[PDB]
Amino acid sequence: TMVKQIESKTAFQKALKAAGDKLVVVDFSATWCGPCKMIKPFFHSLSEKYSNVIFLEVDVDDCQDVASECEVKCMPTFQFFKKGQKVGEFSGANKKKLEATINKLV
Numbered sequence: 001t002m003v004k005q006i007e008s009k010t011a012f013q014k015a016l017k018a019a020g021d022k023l024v025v026v027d028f029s030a031t032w033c034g035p036c037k038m039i040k041p042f043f044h045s046l047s048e049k050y051s052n053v054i055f056l057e058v059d060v061d062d063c064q065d066v067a068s069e070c071e072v073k074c075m076p077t078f079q080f081f082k083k084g085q086k087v088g089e090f091s092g093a094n095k096k097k098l099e100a101t102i103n104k105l106v
């Protein structure tokens with residue numbers, strides 16, 4: 001519910017600017033992706049449990065260009081950002097690790 005959809009390359013660069021010193025979690029997923037749908041409700045629920053963390057969403061079908069530049073091979077892929085810089089990443093619909101990575105990098 002506190003997740004925002006990134007529908008353009010500019011909205012992506014903007015969100016990372018507007019976050020300040022907060023951690024940014026990006027979910028690179030697609031509408032046809034099986035495991036992506038399995039972990040999606042969990043992602044959204046974490047966003048209303050972490051006021052300190054910015055939760056974002058990229059759709060790789062619309063953003064093939066963006067997905068490629070971020071070296072996304074499979075989905076869901078979660079990438080984590082402090083300031084402008086990437087501070088960590090992992091791939092796969094893993095509920096426990098997603099939470100653990102948020103707790104660690106916050």
Ligand SMILES: *SCCS(=O)(=O)O
Pocket residue numbers: 006007008009062063066
């Ligand atoms: S991330 C979306 C890329 S595009 O819709 O501007 O082509």
Ligand SMILES: *SCCS(=O)(=O)O
Pocket residue numbers: 069070071
């Ligand atoms: S994941 C971000 C890719 S790029 O814009 O830094 O090249």
